[PDB]
């Protein structure tokens, strides 16, 4: 019998909401900051309850699906990560009614997967198609969501910078989802938010040039993945040294083989060299690097291992491990490589363009100090994601909790007109839909029960003539005062919870 | 002092309503599973009717104490449908918790429950056309009382019972502006013969007395002597002293009283009404002497039995032997004698073509247990026909009209889009609990059952095609012939929203230790 896994399910259904019920307060731009008590004990004022899930959580398998639920919303959208929490606990309320009714969870699973496919179809008709190749249409569509979000204090000047950034990788009108795996975020320690801009190719950190060039035209991007030293067990220079001759005879011979490997670099043609950390190897010999930099090659050193793997795929500098991999395809081809030392504190190397597949786009984040720099980082990336979610889903939907009240109004109607032993499941699926804007219409104030029934007063007759407007703090049409969102941040918040729900229904 | 505020009130309002709605939903329809009762005297009782059991169950809660008078209004007016008002109103009630758990205020839904009741009654005007002529509509009532008889008290439908029962009502309706009074009719049941035996009496019946078959067993002209005065020596249950001077004085006393027997004859017979009935009784000695003296007399008549024959005839009763007139005699249409049962004795059936003030269907039984179960099927069949004789409004209920208004009220939550939409939603989903409950107590899956006729509402609106509960696989309401009165279903709408309105009436839930104690 499934009676012992029956009790496991209701415990899992109850426990998944109980962590998610704190996010009901944290829902929306008028949502609540949630002060976190740490496992060692400390206060942490926190909003954006996906980050709360990453920070403080309990060890429960229904709760461990919740941190996975928001993480998928983080990587696919990055937005709607608070709303993706509230939809899943809303669906679990629908699950409790039907399991008490005596409906198999296999039935409740497949009914939700049908209604998910069915709801986004009707939601798409609610959406309006916007351009993805018109740069100006993308500008108006993005910043209205950016003014709809919390941070717009720096998103004003940083919206069109992101618009010009994505427009380079918008080659078709289809305009695929977006790789952020060519988008590099680069901090500059000084400078200004006004001086933040988009530098093509990739932007490097501190160079280490012994006698090397500063500005090389038509550079050759090289990679080094080999050591320049002796084996190490206790000492880098394994001598039992007490003598001047034994330290002279063996260490001049260490200079000998690194003479010949350095000459093979410049003869094959190299101007920019990618060197990882000397803890990612055993040692890197700077005297050979001095002789290398005396052969007029600009060199950076001490970069991360996986960060090179970002660089190799972005600018086409395919991995060079030895002398034999000195070729024309393993080496990238920059048009101009130089370092900018001025316009702000610090100094950052500029690979201004490279022979790159697609378009390698890099932003330089500036600011007074690190906290001011970190303000723009959320400001750019949220601006990057709202463009990213609109090029994934062509049409645009006005945001503000109203299309859920729209869609639940149709899905109750269609589930009656369709048929079903599972018709209750879809009609309970639609009853879960208006929970989330109701919990949003608590954070706006202005009683949500009185609120939510008067939006589908307008969604039934005029199909929308009033909305929930956090600008007004309540009843105002999201088409009257424009509150919009991409289509993806609503759909991706919707579909991941449905896939999560059908799993835990089938989970014993 | 403990106060159970709001939800804490409603949790007390859940548990009794949850109990009583669940015991009714196992009892809807001919697949309804029977209700067992042990009395306060410790007596086994098995019915399937709620208005019996709610009267018999010792109610112990404000919800439960309500249900006696709530089901009193349904059974006295409509009859059948005692279970459905309890299943429906509790299903709004348990959903109203979910709305209150959703945060929806209990007042704004109680406001909307009444408006949800309006649009359902509005829909019944469109459902199931209301014209059924007098000769024809007996036959669906012949079919309707076939359903009540042929599955509950007797497995194979006494045909003589359902056809007499539609005929007793036209006896009173014509004299009473196309309506019947339930004190002008009476479901009279006396076992002793055969359970197949069933008669219609336009008046009342009394057991006819004859003392010897050697003395003539008479029946004659259609006029009854409704008497309390002595035509035969009476007995008010006491004793004089007996004294005669001589034995030959008693020999002459038999010759003296024989002339006195003829004097009681020649007074009554010259006024008319040769069937003499006197209230107080006597032995069989001078009874067959009066039978020999050529007028029959009925002895040991019950007290109120002289009243019911008086109003059935419409005439009066003769109080004294010296006051003698025909207006104080019975005015009968037919006085004939038919044997009581098949084996014991005979009655004297006094029919009238004048006054239908007591029209009694007279049934017999071979079992004492079956007849009140038979009469309870006959009690509700005579109440539903009162709805039809006034207006011929009918409903195809049992699963057709339940899913039909559940479409409409849920649509009216969208057509009338405001705050009461969840109240209309709590009304609409609760309508689906009923044809679920006709299949829940049935062997069928009720989850499959709500699916089929829902697709039929996509096919056809205003259905005469709803589910079956005879497991014939033929889901109709006009070929399955499951048809009820539109007035009765509309009354069930009013009663169910009455109870939810009734438990909402004060905001007081405080006690001094004594509000249910």
Swiss-Prot record, chain A:
<dbReference type="GO" id="GO:0140662">
    <property type="term" value="F:ATP-dependent protein folding chaperone"/>
</dbReference>
<feature type="modified residue" description="N6-acetyllysine">
    <location>
        <position position="277"/>
    </location>
</feature>
<dbReference type="InterPro" id="IPR027409">
    <property type="entry name" value="GroEL-like_apical_dom_sf"/>
</dbReference>
<keyword id="KW-0963">Cytoplasm</keyword>
<keyword id="KW-0067">ATP-binding</keyword>
<dbReference type="GO" id="GO:0070062">
    <property type="term" value="C:extracellular exosome"/>
</dbReference>
<feature type="binding site">
    <location>
        <position position="485"/>
    </location>
    <ligand>
        <name>ADP</name>
    </ligand>
</feature>
<feature type="binding site">
    <location>
        <position position="81"/>
    </location>
    <ligand>
        <name>ATP</name>
    </ligand>
</feature>
<dbReference type="Pfam" id="PF00118">
    <property type="entry name" value="Cpn60_TCP1"/>
</dbReference>
<dbReference type="GO" id="GO:0051082">
    <property type="term" value="F:unfolded protein binding"/>
</dbReference>
<comment type="similarity">
    <text>Belongs to the TCP-1 chaperonin family.</text>
</comment>
<keyword id="KW-0488">Methylation</keyword>
<dbReference type="GO" id="GO:0005524">
    <property type="term" value="F:ATP binding"/>
</dbReference>
<feature type="binding site">
    <location>
        <position position="149"/>
    </location>
    <ligand>
        <name>ATP</name>
    </ligand>
</feature>
<feature type="modified residue" description="N6-acetyllysine">
    <location>
        <position position="301"/>
    </location>
</feature>
<feature type="binding site">
    <location>
        <position position="83"/>
    </location>
    <ligand>
        <name>ADP</name>
    </ligand>
</feature>
<dbReference type="GO" id="GO:1904874">
    <property type="term" value="P:positive regulation of telomerase RNA localization to Cajal body"/>
</dbReference>
<dbReference type="InterPro" id="IPR002423">
    <property type="entry name" value="Cpn60/GroEL/TCP-1"/>
</dbReference>
<feature type="binding site">
    <location>
        <position position="81"/>
    </location>
    <ligand>
        <name>ADP</name>
    </ligand>
</feature>
<feature type="modified residue" description="N6-acetyllysine">
    <location>
        <position position="294"/>
    </location>
</feature>
<feature type="modified residue" description="Phosphoserine">
    <location>
        <position position="419"/>
    </location>
</feature>
<dbReference type="GO" id="GO:0042995">
    <property type="term" value="C:cell projection"/>
</dbReference>
UniProtKB/Swiss-Prot annotation, chain B:
<dbReference type="GO" id="GO:0005874">
    <property type="term" value="C:microtubule"/>
</dbReference>
<feature type="binding site">
    <location>
        <position position="82"/>
    </location>
    <ligand>
        <name>ATP</name>
    </ligand>
</feature>
<feature type="cross-link" description="Glycyl lysine isopeptide (Lys-Gly) (interchain with G-Cter in SUMO2)">
    <location>
        <position position="368"/>
    </location>
</feature>
<feature type="binding site">
    <location>
        <position position="80"/>
    </location>
    <ligand>
        <name>Mg(2+)</name>
    </ligand>
</feature>
<dbReference type="GO" id="GO:0051086">
    <property type="term" value="P:chaperone mediated protein folding independent of cofactor"/>
</dbReference>
<dbReference type="GO" id="GO:0031681">
    <property type="term" value="F:G-protein beta-subunit binding"/>
</dbReference>
<comment type="subunit">
    <text>Component of the chaperonin-containing T-complex (TRiC), a hexadecamer composed of two identical back-to-back stacked rings enclosing a protein folding chamber. Each ring is made up of eight different subunits: TCP1/CCT1, CCT2, CCT3, CCT4, CCT5, CCT6A/CCT6, CCT7, CCT8. Interacts with PACRG. Interacts with DNAAF4. Interacts with DLEC1. Interacts with SPMAP2.</text>
</comment>
<keyword id="KW-0547">Nucleotide-binding</keyword>
<keyword id="KW-0597">Phosphoprotein</keyword>
<dbReference type="GO" id="GO:0044183">
    <property type="term" value="F:protein folding chaperone"/>
</dbReference>
<dbReference type="GO" id="GO:0061077">
    <property type="term" value="P:chaperone-mediated protein folding"/>
</dbReference>
<feature type="cross-link" description="Glycyl lysine isopeptide (Lys-Gly) (interchain with G-Cter in SUMO2)">
    <location>
        <position position="190"/>
    </location>
</feature>
<dbReference type="InterPro" id="IPR002194">
    <property type="entry name" value="Chaperonin_TCP-1_CS"/>
</dbReference>
<feature type="binding site">
    <location>
        <position position="83"/>
    </location>
    <ligand>
        <name>ADP</name>
    </ligand>
</feature>
<feature type="binding site">
    <location>
        <position position="489"/>
    </location>
    <ligand>
        <name>ADP</name>
    </ligand>
</feature>
<dbReference type="GO" id="GO:0050821">
    <property type="term" value="P:protein stabilization"/>
</dbReference>
<dbReference type="GO" id="GO:0070062">
    <property type="term" value="C:extracellular exosome"/>
</dbReference>
<dbReference type="InterPro" id="IPR012718">
    <property type="entry name" value="Chap_CCT_epsi"/>
</dbReference>
<protein>
    <recommendedName>
        <fullName>T-complex protein 1 subunit epsilon</fullName>
        <ecNumber>3.6.1.-</ecNumber>
    </recommendedName>
</protein>
<keyword id="KW-0378">Hydrolase</keyword>
<dbReference type="GO" id="GO:0005832">
    <property type="term" value="C:chaperonin-containing T-complex"/>
</dbReference>
<dbReference type="Pfam" id="PF00118">
    <property type="entry name" value="Cpn60_TCP1"/>
</dbReference>
């Amino acid at each position: 019998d499934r009676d012992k896994p029956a009790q496991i399910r209701f415990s899992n259904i109850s426990a998944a909401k109980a962590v998610a019920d704190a996010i009901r307060t944290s829902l929306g731009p008028k949502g609540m900051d949630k002060m976190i008590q740490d496992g060692k004990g400390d206060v942490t004022i926190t909003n954006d309850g996906a980050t709360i899930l990453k920070q403080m959580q309990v060890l429960h398998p229904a709760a461990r699906m919740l941190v996975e639920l928001s993480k998928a919303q983080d990587i696919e959208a990055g937005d709607g990560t608070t709303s993706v929490v509230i939809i899943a606990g809303s669906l679990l309320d629908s699950c409790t009614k039907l399991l008490q009714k005596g409906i198999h969870p296999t039935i409740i699973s497949e009914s939700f997967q049908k209604a998910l496919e069915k709801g986004i179809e009707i939601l798409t008709d609610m959406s309006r198609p916007v351009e993805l190749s018109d740069r100006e249409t993308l500008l108006n569509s993005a910043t209205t969501s950016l003014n709809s979000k919390v941070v717009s204090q720096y998103s004003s000047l940083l919206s069109p910078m992101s618009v010009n950034a994505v427009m380079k990788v918008i080659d078709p009108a289809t305009a695929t989802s977006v790789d952020l795996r060519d988008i590099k975020i680069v901090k500059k320690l000084g400078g200004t938010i006004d001086d933040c801009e988009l530098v093509e190719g990739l932007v490097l950190t501190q160079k280490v040039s012994n006698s090397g060039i500063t500005r090389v035209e038509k550079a050759k991007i090289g990679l080094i993945q080999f050591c320049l030293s002796a084996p190490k067990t206790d000492m880098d220079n394994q001598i039992v040294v007490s003598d001047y001759a034994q330290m002279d005879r063996v260490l001049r011979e260490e200079r000998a083989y690194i003479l010949n490997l350095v000459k093979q670099i410049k003869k094959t043609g190299c101007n920019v060299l990618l060197i990882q950390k000397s803890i990612l190897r055993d040692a890197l010999s700077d005297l050979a690097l001095h002789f290398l930099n005396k052969m007029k090659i600009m060199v950076i050193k001490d970069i991360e291992r996986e960060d090179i793997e970002f660089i190799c795929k972005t600018i086409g500098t395919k991995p060079v491990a030895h002398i034999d991999q000195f070729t024309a395809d393993m080496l990238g081809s920059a048009e101009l490589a130089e370092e900018v030392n001025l316009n702000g504190s610090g100094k950052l190397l500029k690979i201004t363009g490279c022979a790159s597949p697609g378009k390698t786009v890099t932003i330089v984040v500036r600011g007074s100090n690190k906290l001011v720099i970190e303000e723009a980082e959320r400001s750019i990336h949220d601006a990057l994601c709202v463009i990213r979610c609109l090029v994934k889903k062509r049409a645009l939907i006005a945001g503000g909790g109203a299309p859920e009240i729209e869609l639940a109004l149709r899905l109750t109607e269609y589930s009656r007109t369709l048929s079903g032993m599972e018709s209750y499941c879809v009609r309970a699926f639609a009853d879960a839909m208006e929970v989330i804007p109701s919990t949003l219409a608590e954070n706006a104030g202005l009683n949500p029960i009185s609120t939510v029934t008067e939006l589908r007063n307008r969604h039934a007759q005029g199909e929308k003539t009033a909305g929930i407007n956090v600008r007004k703090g309540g009843i105002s049409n999201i088409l009257e005062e424009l509150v919009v969102q991409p289509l993806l941040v609503s759909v991706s918040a919707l579909t991941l919870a449905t896939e999560t729900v059908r799993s835990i229904l089938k989970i014993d | 002092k403990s106060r159970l505020m709001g939800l804490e009130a409603l949790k007390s309002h859940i548990m009794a309503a949850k109990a009583v709605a669940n015991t009714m939903r196992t009892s809807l329809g001919p697949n309804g599973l029977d209700k067992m009762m042990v009395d306060k005297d410790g007596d086994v009782t098995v019915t399937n009717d709620g208005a019996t059991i709610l009267s018999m169950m010792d109610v112990d809660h404000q919800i439960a104490k309500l249900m006696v008078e709530l089901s009193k209004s349904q059974d006295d007016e409509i009859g059948d449908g005692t279970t459905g008002v309890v299943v429906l109103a509790g299903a709004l009630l348990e959903e109203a918790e979910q709305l209150l758990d959703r945060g929806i205020h209990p007042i704004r839904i109680a406001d909307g429950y009444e408006q949800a009741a309006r649009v359902a009654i509005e829909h019944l005007d469109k459902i199931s056309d209301s014209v059924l002529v007098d000769i024809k509509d007996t036959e669906p009532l012949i079919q309707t009382a076939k359903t009540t008889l042929g599955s509950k008290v007797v497995n194979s439908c006494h045909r003589q019972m359902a056809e007499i029962a539609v005929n007793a009502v036209l006896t009173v309706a014509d004299m009473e502006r196309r309506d019947v009074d339930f004190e002008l009719i009476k479901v009279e049941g006396k076992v002793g013969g055969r359970l197949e035996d069933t008669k219609l009496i336009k008046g009342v019946i009394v057991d006819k007395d004859f003392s010897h078959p050697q003395m003539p067993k008479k029946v004659e002209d259609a006029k009854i002597a409704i008497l309390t005065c002595p035509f035969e020596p009476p007995k008010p249950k006491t004793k004089h002293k007996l004294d005669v001077t001589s034995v030959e004085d008693y020999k002459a006393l038999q010759k003296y009283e024989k002339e006195k027997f003829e004097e009681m004859i020649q007074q009554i017979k010259e006024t008319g009404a040769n069937l003499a009935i006197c209230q107080w009784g006597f032995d069989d000695e001078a009874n067959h002497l009066l039978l020999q003296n050529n007028l029959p007399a009925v002895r040991w008549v019950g007290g109120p039995e002289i009243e019911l024959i008086a109003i059935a005839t419409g005439g009066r009763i003769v109080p004294r032997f010296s006051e003698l007139t025909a207006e104080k005699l019975g005015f009968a249409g037919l006085v004939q004698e038919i044997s009581f049962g098949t084996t014991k004795d005979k009655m004297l059936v006094i029919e009238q073509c004048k006054n239908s003030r007591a029209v009694t269907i007279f049934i017999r039984g071979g079992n004492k247990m079956i007849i009140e179960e038979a009469k309870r099927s006959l009690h509700d069949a005579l109440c539903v026909i009162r709805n039809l004789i006034r207006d011929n409004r009918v409903v195809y209920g049992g699963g057709a009209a339940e899913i039909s208004c559940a479409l409409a009220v849920s649509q009216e939550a969208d057509k009338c889009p405001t705050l009461e939409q969840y109240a209309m939603r709590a009304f609409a989903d609760a309508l689906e609990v009923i044809p679920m409950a006709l299949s829940e107590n049935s062997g069928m899956n009720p989850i499959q059952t709500m699916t089929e006729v829902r697709a039929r509402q996509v096919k056809e609106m205003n259905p005469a095609l709803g589910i079956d509960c005879l497991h014939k696989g033929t889901n109709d309401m006009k070929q399955q012939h499951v048809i009820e009165t539109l007035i009765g279903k509309k009354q069930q709408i009013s009663l169910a929203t009455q109870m939810v309105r009734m438990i909402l009436k004060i905001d007081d839930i405080r006690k001094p230790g004594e509000s249910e104690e």
